[PDB]
Symmetry: C3
């Protein structure tokens, strides 16, 4: 099948720091690299489909947020990666296919996707990281 973009885009942001951490300006979600242990939560992403009674709901990551079957937040330097797993909170069945995370069943799903650290990465370089997901459907 293939992804058809049809929806809005959610960006999950995380600033990764060392132990001595200097917050400058507006409050922003930050973690020290020591907090990037396996399964550590990064954040939730709300998803609400409508008009999808006969389509499989899908999310597509930006090109700089995936490599084959793996997802990652990408540093603002465009290089450094923070690998993550993406999981619905209702434990419904989804499939990953080259940047696309799509629901196995048709229907206008409403849910919450959690983004978690995939494998211990406590040596991740400091930086401002982002994962960008766009709604659509899989056919």
């Amino acid at each position: 099948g293939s992804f058809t973009p049809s929806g809005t885009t959610g960006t999950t942001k995380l600033t990764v720091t060392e132990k001595c951490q200097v917050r400058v300006g507006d409050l922003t979600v930050a973690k020290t690299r020591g907090q990037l242990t396996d399964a550590a939560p990064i954040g939730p992403v709300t998803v609400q489909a409508l008009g999808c009674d006969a389509r499989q709901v899908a999310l597509k990551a930006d090109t700089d947020n995936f490599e084959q079957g793996k997802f990652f937040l990408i540093s603002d330097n465009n290089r450094d990666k923070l690998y993550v797993n993406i999981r619905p909170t209702d434990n419904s069945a989804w499939t990953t296919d080259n940047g696309v995370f799509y629901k196995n069943d048709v229907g206008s799903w409403g849910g919450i996707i959690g983004i978690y650290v995939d494998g211990q990465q406590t040596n991740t370089p400091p930086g401002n990281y982002t994962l960008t997901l766009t709604g659509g459907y899989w056919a």
Copy 2:
């Protein structure tokens, strides 16, 4: 005539989708392409001029948002256009000149500019569209 940039910039954004629409994250302005009917409102843009008692208030569209006396929101990839009309909500008269929408008389105008779909465009490709307007003043 010429436009002098002097003010701030308003960005009008719209995400166009198909009927099966998947909203991800925070609520943002989205429409299905079927909702892109003639005169459908894209959004308001508030304008307030100060110190322009002797100048003609003006809004300049970004280069990528105008051509041939026509304004349009443009997709993120610069390819796809969504043509619009730009209209103040009061009785005031304005002129379009090469990407600049300027008021026909001088004065520190304040008001609401509506951006509307110009001609039914229900086949617009899904994507993120933007129209950027910068305040300033115009003169011949």
Copy 3:
């Protein structure tokens, strides 16, 4: 010594206009060029350090925001500078070193850094100016 980025980034923005000023869309920080008098405030920057009991808290300006021990907001096109002084409100001692503004003492400082116009610059060209500061620490 040298700077280690470790913290979040604060962006200070200002739109400079002429006397006839046309605000478009949401309110943003704007000043006429005539308001760019000596020491005119551009804005505050809240700073809170944690885990730095043994390091010197530091802010590093983007490469396009510093020169010759001078800091400045820069216009969108990277040409026009608006020189500023950066000063903590508690008048603690800090040092400037090639784009880094670091605290002379060690410790997890919590404070407010004010950004102010350095010398009257009432001829600054209208445009959008930005100063970007990143949190980290200085080490010898």
